[PDB]
Amino acid sequence: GIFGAIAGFIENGWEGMVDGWYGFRHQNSEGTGQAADLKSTQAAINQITGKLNRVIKKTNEKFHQIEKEFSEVEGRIQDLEKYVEDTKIDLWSYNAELLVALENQHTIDLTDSEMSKLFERTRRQLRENAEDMGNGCFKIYHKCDNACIGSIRNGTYDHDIYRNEALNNRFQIK
Amino acid sequence: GIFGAIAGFIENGWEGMVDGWYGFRHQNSEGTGQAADLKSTQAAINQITGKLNRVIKKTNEKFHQIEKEFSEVEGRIQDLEKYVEDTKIDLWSYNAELLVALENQHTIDLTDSEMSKLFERTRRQLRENAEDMGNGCFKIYHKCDNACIGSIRNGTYDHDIYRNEALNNRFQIK
Amino acid sequence: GIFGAIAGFIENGWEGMVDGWYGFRHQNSEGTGQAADLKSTQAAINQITGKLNRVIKKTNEKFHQIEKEFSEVEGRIQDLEKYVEDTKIDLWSYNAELLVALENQHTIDLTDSEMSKLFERTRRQLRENAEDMGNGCFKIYHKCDNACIGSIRNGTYDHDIYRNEALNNRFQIK
Amino acid sequence: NSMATLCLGHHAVPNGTLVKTITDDQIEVTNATELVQSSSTGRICNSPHQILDGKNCTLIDALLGDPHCDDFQNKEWDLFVERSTAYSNCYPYYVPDYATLRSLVASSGNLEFTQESFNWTGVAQDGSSYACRRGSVNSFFSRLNWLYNLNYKYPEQNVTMPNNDKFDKLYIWGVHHPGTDKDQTNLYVQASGRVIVSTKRSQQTVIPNIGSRPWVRGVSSIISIYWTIVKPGDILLINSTGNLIAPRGYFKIQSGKSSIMRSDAHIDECNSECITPNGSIPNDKPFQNVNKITYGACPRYVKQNTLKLATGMRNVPEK
Amino acid sequence: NSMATLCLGHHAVPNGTLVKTITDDQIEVTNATELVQSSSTGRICNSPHQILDGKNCTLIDALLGDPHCDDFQNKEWDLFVERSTAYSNCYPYYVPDYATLRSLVASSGNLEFTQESFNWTGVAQDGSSYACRRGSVNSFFSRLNWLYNLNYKYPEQNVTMPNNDKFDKLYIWGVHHPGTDKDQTNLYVQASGRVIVSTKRSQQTVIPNIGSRPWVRGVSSIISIYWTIVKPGDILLINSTGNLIAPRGYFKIQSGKSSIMRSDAHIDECNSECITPNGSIPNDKPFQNVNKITYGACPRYVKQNTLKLATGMRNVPEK
Amino acid sequence: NSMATLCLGHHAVPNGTLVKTITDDQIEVTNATELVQSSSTGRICNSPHQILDGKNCTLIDALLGDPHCDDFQNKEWDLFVERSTAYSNCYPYYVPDYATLRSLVASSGNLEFTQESFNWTGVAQDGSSYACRRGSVNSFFSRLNWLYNLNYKYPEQNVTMPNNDKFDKLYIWGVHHPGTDKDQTNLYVQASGRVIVSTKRSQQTVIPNIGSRPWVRGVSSIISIYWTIVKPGDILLINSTGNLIAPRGYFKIQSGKSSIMRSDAHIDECNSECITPNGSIPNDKPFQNVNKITYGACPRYVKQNTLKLATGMRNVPEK
Ligand SMILES: *[C@@H]1O[C@H](CO)[C@@H](O[C@@H]2O[C@H](CO)[C@@H](O[C@H]3O[C@H](CO[C@H]4O[C@H](CO)[C@@H](O)[C@H](O)[C@@H]4O)[C@@H](O)[C@H](O[C@H]4O[C@H](CO)[C@@H](O)[C@H](O)[C@@H]4O[C@H]4O[C@H](CO)[C@@H](O)[C@H](O)[C@@H]4O)[C@@H]3O)[C@H](O)[C@H]2NC(C)=O)[C@H](O)[C@H]1NC(C)=O
Ligand SMILES: *[C@@H]1O[C@H](CO)[C@@H](O[C@@H]2O[C@H](CO)[C@@H](O[C@H]3O[C@H](CO[C@H]4O[C@H](CO)[C@@H](O)[C@H](O)[C@@H]4O)[C@@H](O)[C@H](O[C@H]4O[C@H](CO)[C@@H](O)[C@H](O)[C@@H]4O[C@H]4O[C@H](CO)[C@@H](O)[C@H](O)[C@@H]4O)[C@@H]3O)[C@H](O)[C@H]2NC(C)=O)[C@H](O)[C@H]1NC(C)=O
Ligand SMILES: *[C@@H]1O[C@H](CO)[C@@H](O[C@@H]2O[C@H](CO)[C@@H](O[C@H]3O[C@H](CO[C@H]4O[C@H](CO)[C@@H](O)[C@H](O)[C@@H]4O)[C@@H](O)[C@H](O[C@H]4O[C@H](CO)[C@@H](O)[C@H](O)[C@@H]4O[C@H]4O[C@H](CO)[C@@H](O)[C@H](O)[C@@H]4O)[C@@H]3O)[C@H](O)[C@H]2NC(C)=O)[C@H](O)[C@H]1NC(C)=O
Ligand SMILES: *[C@@H]1O[C@H](CO)[C@@H](O[C@@H]2O[C@H](CO)[C@@H](O[C@@H]3O[C@H](CO)[C@@H](O)[C@H](O[C@H]4O[C@H](CO)[C@@H](O)[C@H](O[C@H]5O[C@H](CO)[C@@H](O)[C@H](O)[C@@H]5O)[C@@H]4O)[C@@H]3O)[C@H](O)[C@H]2NC(C)=O)[C@H](O)[C@H]1NC(C)=O
Ligand SMILES: *[C@@H]1O[C@H](CO)[C@@H](O[C@@H]2O[C@H](CO)[C@@H](O[C@@H]3O[C@H](CO[C@H]4O[C@H](CO)[C@@H](O)[C@H](O)[C@@H]4O)[C@@H](O)[C@H](O[C@H]4O[C@H](CO)[C@@H](O)[C@H](O)[C@@H]4O)[C@@H]3O)[C@H](O)[C@H]2NC(C)=O)[C@H](O)[C@H]1NC(C)=O
Ligand SMILES: *[C@@H]1O[C@H](CO)[C@@H](O[C@@H]2O[C@H](CO)[C@@H](O[C@@H]3O[C@H](CO[C@H]4O[C@H](CO)[C@@H](O)[C@H](O)[C@@H]4O)[C@@H](O)[C@H](O[C@H]4O[C@H](CO)[C@@H](O)[C@H](O)[C@@H]4O)[C@@H]3O)[C@H](O)[C@H]2NC(C)=O)[C@H](O)[C@H]1NC(C)=O
Ligand SMILES: *[C@@H]1O[C@H](CO)[C@@H](O[C@@H]2O[C@H](CO)[C@@H](O[C@@H]3O[C@H](CO)[C@@H](O)[C@H](O[C@H]4O[C@H](CO)[C@@H](O)[C@H](O)[C@@H]4O)[C@@H]3O)[C@H](O)[C@H]2NC(C)=O)[C@H](O)[C@H]1NC(C)=O
Ligand SMILES: *[C@@H]1O[C@H](CO)[C@@H](O[C@@H]2O[C@H](CO)[C@@H](O[C@@H]3O[C@H](CO)[C@@H](O)[C@H](O[C@H]4O[C@H](CO)[C@@H](O)[C@H](O)[C@@H]4O)[C@@H]3O)[C@H](O)[C@H]2NC(C)=O)[C@H](O)[C@H]1NC(C)=O
């Protein structure tokens, strides 16, 4: 997409994540795990549900119109009755083709955005205790048990407690 | 929006910034102030004025056309006269409805952009002397008087002279 | 554009680059060089070729239609044959006018996007061994010969073997 | 040095669908939905729209009163369905602006007939014909009154009829074209004549033309069918030397959602807002590919038979 | 503390507006402007377009030359405005394809009448009637010449009139259908006849039908109004046995921005390029909701009564 | 020296191109491609569409068989080209709804004529005229048979001709309108006359009007031209007591992609899918400003003369 996160610096998706659209995978001292993120998932879904309802509009509903098939050759007036209906169908076929094209381009780019937004939210939160590895993963430089991981996934991660521990693990003689 | 800054990590907008659209707000030892950014404000207005002028403007000038109302039952030819005009009205109603949805979706996204661009442009300036608190505010690790703050609102902020002081406040026995 | 990279934090473009759409200029002990990045150049081209091929798409083969120029005064029926063709032309003119403006707006944004992607690719690649000068350039804090530079542009820069040398230059007395 | 990794990722599916975008032509998202209804059941649901199956009767034959169409008298409808197997079994006729007369009656929505007493003096009424047999017994169109000679005489006729109600009134009448100058005198005694049917706002004048016509059900003659709308405060004014196929009354002409459609589709017990000639179709989708002829709340006909709208991110499965 | 905190942000307002987007139905921005014109003064501006208030005269009644329409001779317009209070006050007439004649005269944009002396012989000219009365004095359609018997004779006419100019000529002629057989012979001595009006390109034939018509203003007769256009180098050629309401000349007929509109709106002294039957509306918006009938540089008629184009960012306010 | 700088950038060109966007009216990009095709050679390419050069004959004149148009008999076309230098050099005629008969014959795509033998009796055939000369030798339309009296007798023709084939049949015929009552009786020894042409589905009746018409090639008469289509199982019934311009057979009517266009452009041995009255144009672009009249696979006509689609990024050169 235009944000380069889905099909971009995230090498692939997770078929095994069925409780959301965006989520966390972690590896720490107690083991490994996976957890969907509800905010980003609900953000993307509510946008796609919204545009979907505008598209299935619904309006129209016509009753007595013009005849559109003819069993006799008639000439001028019939040439017009056909040209009008033909003109209209091409114009609506165009609208329908362009609508799906524009919408799908936007459906992809917004789902790309929601991924990038969840990454930036996580980046700001970790502050100076983690480095971006480049694949949507963070290396967290301090002991971060399940409580610490959970405090990131919910938005209550206090970087200050781990800052001194993390800053030392980053700077030395590697 | 798609950049997640307005109605994003910026929790709300300053209802009392009457002199601009985007701007700064500070607190140093001297006092707390506020000032709008002319560059980002003018950028957003000129794009919105631009699309406004394309959307207003002529030209639809029509002078002798078909009769749109009828006091008599006439049948076939009036059926067609009605169908042609009704067909035209639905198509334009669609064009108008879709036009406003696309413009407004983009009017919102481009303003969200200009917020994020001013932020990133600022972080490129402070380089290694400040940290992103994640809410839209920077924490600056050196003494920055009002002339120093004012030097951030223009390209004049020379990070080289504050680097040694800032790094020490960032890294110490914490 | 909306990513603030082209005509943005990159002041201007390089008329000296003709073998790519995006690239690297570098400066080290051995001197200067210039190489185009194929992956990003190709990515922006494949999209523009895609939309160019969708826009130029065989459709619209019509044969016997209505008459559209008249050499007699006939009134009601001719008024309609003209209103029909006139209504149609205005509609396809609007479709044409809007299609160009959307595709052109998107083409600018998406090319601006690919420049930003390449920058964020290079930034993550350098980890903690360089800093953003703001002009679109990175200041690398270690000895990086032409071979080293090559590994950066080519996904093979191993930041670990320079991290100690780099951090020593970034923090010290200066 | 006990570190920890935290990875951000997304949603992926084994069974993606290809959608279409501004830049790519086929691209795999996790999920999409169809926007073009392309299938029908082949049957017309009997509700919500009040269907009136014409069967062997066309709307005009029912209007005029073809004896085998008597079961359509005073019938109302939301959609009249004309069938290809229909026929005519009464006197041979032809209607200039047939399409127009059929159009305005179809949109009226009813065949509600109201009789009126035209003061014909000196003429024998209720003319019959072998070509329009009502079971081996002779008769004519039910809503038309054939005037012929009474005691080897025909007086030049004149009658007024006003519209004193608050609604437009639709009058259907005709003019007889005998096939030989023999039949012309044996019916109206005169050699040829004029029929002048007028209102304050309209004017109609017909001259009969004697001459042979294609043999149909016994007779080589034909009737021409004409219609006249009389608005409130206006007048209908017949004036005729002969050859007049007189009206018996008016039809209430209304405006509403009513229409007509040609289709041989069977009518089934179900419910569907949208009707097409080849069957009822659903209208949950915004576009449809079944037929450009529709009636009711329908999707808009388009040339495409499929347009998938993406409802998910790009699918990037197991690499 | 060696501290300083720099915050970046965006402005906001208390009173934001809701707008439609691709994603959301109602979302609050800081400022939007309306794109649909939905109001009018109720009055028509008489500039920059040259308006012609028809008053009690229809464009057809001015064309033919009604007495009370005398004030429209040789007049021009850009927008002719027919009123609902209009009436006729001359001989009863009817016009086949009235809609077409009105349409073509309206687009022509003038009534500039040129006199022409046709060479009628043996026939009384300037016939008048009790219906078309210019005071107590009986007179007739100003642009029409009623031909009738002279010394109890009417000789079959034949008269030419070539178009020796460079522009199109428009002739408005007619045919008389009298109520009685007696009136036919008092005016034209002979029985019903043929009026044959052809050109090199056109061809028109009318057969007068004597009959009783709706009694109007003293007469139970009627006049069928027809028209003819003569090309440069072409020739108008009349051949009438009788029953001819002959023309006094031609109208010049060229093309341009002229048209006609039914409306009862008063006319003030303002300036608005866009006219609707409801009055003038300002064309500063690209769409409008007043009327589908428009004349001039107008916004395009849509079905919505409001489309708010957002001209600001999201409104995010308080907590 | 412990230092190395890596700059990232994008290219530029010295000469951009201005394009339109949603935001700007003009903005510079490195590249664009035109979308409006607004030029042509001025020459219709004779392939891949079967072109037929009408030269001096309107399609109606070739249909009827004007002598100077005998080349065009039994021709086929995908596009018939009518030239402004066309003249008519036979008997004078006019066609009510000329436009329709021109439209339907042009859409049928051929002039394949099949001769049939009607059993005319007591009547002289192959009537010729001084106005329609085939080499200073009097003759007439090649597809019309002029019937007149034989030995002071014109027995009432009555003849049927059924369509026992798959293809529909198109018959062309006419009614002669003599100038004087003398010409009427000299040709048909009976005043007036009558022509009744019937199918089971259609009925055309014409009464010839005697009267002087504009002098053309020595005659003051004229011929009305009529057409009639007969579907399989149907019948063609002609009943004339005089003044019939009989047919000689039927035209084979088909339904295809044939049409007709007015131009004076020359025809070359090139090849182009799209045809305009200005010569062929390339259909590589999606829109065209050449003409709203097109034939075949063409770009859609728009009003803009240029619409540039950006094919590159913003062009930002030396500051
Ligand atoms: C002007 O020119 C036209 C055209 O030529 C001419 O019109 C012709 O008129 C005659 C009049 O009789 C008519 O004759 C036939 O009509 C019937 C044809 O019916 C079908 O026959 C076949 C299939 O069924 C098929 O080939 C045909 O195409 C058609 O579909 C037919 O009834 C007639 O046959 C009669 O023969 C004797 C006559 O008594 C009887 O033994 C028959 O039963 C039948 O008629 C009698 O039947 C019933 C029995 O109960 C009886 O009650 C009734 O009274 C009737 O007398 C003929 O074959 C032509 O069809 C018709 N042609 C067209 C094209 O219309 C005009 O007559 C001419 N004008 C003048 C003034 O002469
Ligand atoms: C064929 O069939 C038609 C149908 O009937 C028939 O036509 C009919 O003809 C009669 C007589 O001509 C006509 O009768 C009167 O119609 C007028 C309309 O009536 C109402 O409207 C008026 C207001 O708009 C007003 O008068 C009343 O409200 C009225 O109720 C009516 O006006 C006429 O009245 C005049 O008739 C005679 C003529 O002398 C007098 O009795 C009256 O006073 C009146 O005016 C006379 O007096 C004044 C006094 O000074 C005098 O100045 C004036 O000049 C005049 O002489 C009509 O009589 C029917 O309307 C009409 N039917 C229609 C139209 O449907 C044909 O006659 C039939 N064909 C044949 C050959 O017989
Ligand atoms: C009702 O009223 C109409 C109109 O008032 C009337 O129609 C008129 O009828 C007359 C008689 O037929 C006719 O008169 C001559 O018109 C011909 C056209 O003239 C045009 O030619 C010019 C040059 O071509 C051109 O500039 C103009 O457009 C001009 O108007 C004219 O050719 C005829 O005259 C030739 O023919 C006669 C007959 O032989 C000869 O006597 C003449 O000398 C002349 O040329 C002769 O010489 C040439 C050698 O050069 C020779 O080769 C040739 O054979 C010929 O003999 C016509 O006489 C009017 O044109 C016509 N007008 C209209 C409008 O139709 C009706 O007749 C009236 N109805 C009744 C029942 O009476
Ligand atoms: C188109 O424009 C032309 C140009 O003006 C018009 O032409 C004119 O037509 C009229 C009518 O056709 C012509 O007058 C007739 O001339 C003929 C010439 O032969 C003449 O026979 C006829 O008189 C006959 O008609 C009378 C009708 O009342 C009969 O009663 C009478 O017949 C009886 O009388 C004789 C006594 O002599 C007895 O022997 C018998 O008892 C007989 O039965 C009489 O013979 C008319 O006078 C006129 O000449 C002509 N003008 C020109 C310049 O050619 C067309 O009329 C016009 N057509 C339209 C408008 O449709
Ligand atoms: C909804 O309702 C509509 C209306 O019926 C249906 O749409 C029609 O579908 C039929 C197919 O079932 C279409 O008919 C086909 O198209 C062509 C039309 O025939 C042309 O060619 C002949 C001469 O060859 C001309 O005379 C004629 O005027 C036409 O120009 C043909 O190509 C097809 O012929 C095929 O069938 C015959 C046997 O039947 C074979 O022998 C042939 O070789 C050939 O293969 C056929 O006739 C029709 O055009 C459609 N549109 C209409 C009628 O307007 C929908 O199918 C129906 N259902 C749905 C779900 O939409
Ligand atoms: C600019 O000029 C135009 C032209 O007149 C005006 O448009 C008219 O607007 C009025 C009011 O909106 C319309 O009048 C009303 O329409 C009602 C519904 O219309 C349909 O429904 C009935 C079914 O009952 C059909 O029979 C009918 O033919 C219509 O198809 C009618 O019901 C109204 O009747 C009256 O009675 C009811 C009582 O039930 C009252 O409550 C109503 O108020 C009303 O007085 C009435 O007919 C009218 O149809 C419009 N005309 C046209 C041509 O569009 C604009 O209003 C005017 N101004 C502006 C700003 O645009
Ligand atoms: C259509 O074409 C047909 C061709 O068949 C044509 O039909 C013919 O019509 C005429 C008149 O309408 C018929 O003539 C009649 O013939 C019968 C047969 O015996 C006679 O009895 C009639 O005599 C009466 O008519 C006289 C008229 O002056 C009276 O004076 C006399 O006293 C008699 O009452 C009359 O002559 C003719 O028979 C038919 N043809 C055939 C083959 O039967 C018809 O006219 C055409 N219609 C058009 C062109 O409109
Ligand atoms: C509309 O309806 C009216 C009302 O009936 C009708 O008017 C009537 O027409 C008849 C026919 O013209 C008139 O009756 C006439 O009466 C006079 C009395 O003086 C007679 O002279 C007439 O007889 C003629 O008949 C011969 C032919 O057989 C002629 O050659 C001869 O010369 C005689 O004149 C004729 O019978 C009647 O007077 C009028 N009016 C009324 C009130 O009856 C009119 O015909 C209808 N309009 C149509 C049918 O178009």
Ligand SMILES: *[C@@H]1O[C@H](CO)[C@@H](O[C@@H]2O[C@H](CO)[C@@H](O)[C@H](O)[C@H]2NC(C)=O)[C@H](O)[C@H]1NC(C)=O
């Ligand atoms: C146009 O017609 C109207 C009818 O509505 C005339 O208005 C009336 O005319 C009478 C007679 O002069 C006056 O007494 C009334 O006061 C008028 N107004 C009404 C009845 O409301 C009008 O005079 C006619 N002529 C014009 C407008 O020039």
Ligand SMILES: *[C@@H]1O[C@H](CO)[C@@H](O)[C@H](O)[C@H]1NC(C)=O
């Ligand atoms: C934050 O993490 C804690 C674990 O310490 C958990 O109990 C809580 O539910 C999380 N917050 C939310 C909003 O779920």
Ligand SMILES: *[C@@H]1O[C@H](CO)[C@@H](O)[C@H](O)[C@H]1NC(C)=O
């Ligand atoms: C900011 O930069 C420009 C150029 O010097 C000017 O607006 C202003 O003087 C500067 N402000 C400070 C505080 O230097």
Ligand SMILES: *[C@@H]1O[C@H](CO)[C@@H](O)[C@H](O)[C@H]1NC(C)=O
């Ligand atoms: C990328 O890897 C190293 C960089 O020095 C080099 O050996 C290799 O050739 C590079 N790739 C290409 C295509 O040259």
